[PDB]
Amino acid sequence: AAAAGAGPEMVRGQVFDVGPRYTNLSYIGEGAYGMVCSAYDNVNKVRVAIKKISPFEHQTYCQRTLREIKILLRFRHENIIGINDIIRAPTIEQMKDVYIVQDLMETDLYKLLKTQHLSNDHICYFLYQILRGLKYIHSANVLHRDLKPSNLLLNTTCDLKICDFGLARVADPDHDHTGFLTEYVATRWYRAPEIMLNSKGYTKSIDIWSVGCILAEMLSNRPIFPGKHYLDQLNHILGILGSPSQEDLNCIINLKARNYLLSLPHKNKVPWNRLFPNADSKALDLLDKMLTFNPHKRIEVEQALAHPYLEQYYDPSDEPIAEAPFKFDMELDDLPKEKLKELIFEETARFQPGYRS
Numbered sequence: 001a002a003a004a005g006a007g008p009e010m011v012r013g014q015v016f017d018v019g020p021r022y023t024n025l026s027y028i029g030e031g032a033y034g035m036v037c038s039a040y041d042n043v044n045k046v047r048v049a050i051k052k053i054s055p056f057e058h059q060t061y062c063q064r065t066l067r068e069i070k071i072l073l074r075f076r077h078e079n080i081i082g083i084n085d086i087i088r089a090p091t092i093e094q095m096k097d098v099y100i101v102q103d104l105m106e107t108d109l110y111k112l113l114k115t116q117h118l119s120n121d122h123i124c125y126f127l128y129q130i131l132r133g134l135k136y137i138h139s140a141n142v143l144h145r146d147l148k149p150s151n152l153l154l155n156t157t158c159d160l161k162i163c164d165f166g167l168a169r170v171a172d173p174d175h176d177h178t179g180f181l182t183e184y185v186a187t188r189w190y191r192a193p194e195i196m197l198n199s200k201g202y203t204k205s206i207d208i209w210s211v212g213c214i215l216a217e218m219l220s221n222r223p224i225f226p227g228k229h230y231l232d233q234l235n236h237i238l239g240i241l242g243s244p245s246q247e248d249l250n251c252i253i254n255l256k257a258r259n260y261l262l263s264l265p266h267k268n269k270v271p272w273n274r275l276f277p278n279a280d281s282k283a284l285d286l287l288d289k290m291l292t293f294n295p296h297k298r299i300e301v302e303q304a305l306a307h308p309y310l311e312q313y314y315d316p317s318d319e320p321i322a323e324a325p326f327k328f329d330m331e332l333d334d335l336p337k338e339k340l341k342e343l344i345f346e347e348t349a350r351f352q353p354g355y356r357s
């Protein structure tokens with residue numbers, strides 16, 4: 001209809017018409033590219049979140065939108081945000097925006113860390129939930145590739161859900177190698193050291209590093225490695241971990257990357273307990289294992305779940321995995337704008353009336 005509008009201005013938050021089902025005028029924030037509002041779901045009789053997506057002018061936006069929709073519709077897990085509904089025109093010709101309806105969450109870990117100290121009990125629970133969700137993701141052979149506090153939503157009872165699969169990919173360790181200083185898209189402060197050295201981020205260890213950075217951030221309310229540019233990120237990491245060992249260096253076969261590391265002055269490890277003097281010692285042991293330089297030696301998700309820090313929560317029978325891996329195209333690079341729009345239309349069909357009387 002359009003009978004509803006939500007305080008427009010910048011972005012383009014003119015119209016927000018989400019059929020008759022959803023009826024309230026409460027803006028929340030700005031998505032990657034569209035207003036997010038809360039609304040009353042007149043069917044389930046609860047407030048929900050709705051993201052307006054207007055992706056159809058940029059190939060990158062469409063790609064990320066399709067990737068996220070395909071993934072979220074296939075995943076079903078307590079610690080991963082779901083899609084409850086998708087609102088769009090009934091034909092491709094008329095489709096100009098897409099609205100994604102999701103459970104309403106109170107906040108995200110970014111906003112929470114800006115103003116709230118976390119108890120060790122909250123840190124432990126939040127880490128548990130992140131890892132529980134990540135187990136499922138990885139079990140589907142999917143890498144999230146952009147884990148960070150703003151991608152972790154929380155409700156009023158501290159239930160945590162991972163969001164934003166726009167940069168996700170299917171794991172491909174056999175094709176992970178690349179040259180030194182290869183450009184990378186995911187958020188700088190949460191990038192593993194190998195991204196800057198010799199890795200395209202196509203293995204599960206990339207996500208464990210990000211989780212380790214999030215744990216550190218929870219312990220002190222500050223990002224642990226706030227690089228200001230691409231290579232600064234690596235110097236922040238080495239400033240705390242110290243210089244890599246001969247064995248870990250020998251693992252980096254690429255000469256430019258090797259020689260860069262060899263060119264650096266020797267740095268000694270900064271002990272975790274001096275960075276985080278109020279932290280639980282078991283938390284720091286787990287942190288150390290997640291923030292391991294060598295990605296091959298880095299802890300895997302399931303090992304992390306089994307670590308003593310998380311013993312109060314660990315229960316592998318209640319930490320589900322995906323029914324089968326994804327092998328769908330997540331690169332989506334060789335598709336014209338017309339095919340991407342068509343795939344988004346097809347992927348969202350299940351939510352249409354389409355066939356009523």
Ligand SMILES: O=c1c2cc(O)c(O)cc2oc2cc(O)cc(O)c12
Pocket residue numbers: 028029030031032036048049051081102103104105153
């Ligand atoms: O995407 C969401 C979002 C998604 C949900 O399912 C939800 O329940 C709450 C959300 O809040 C946001 C707030 C923002 O400032 C920006 C956002 O992108 C979101």
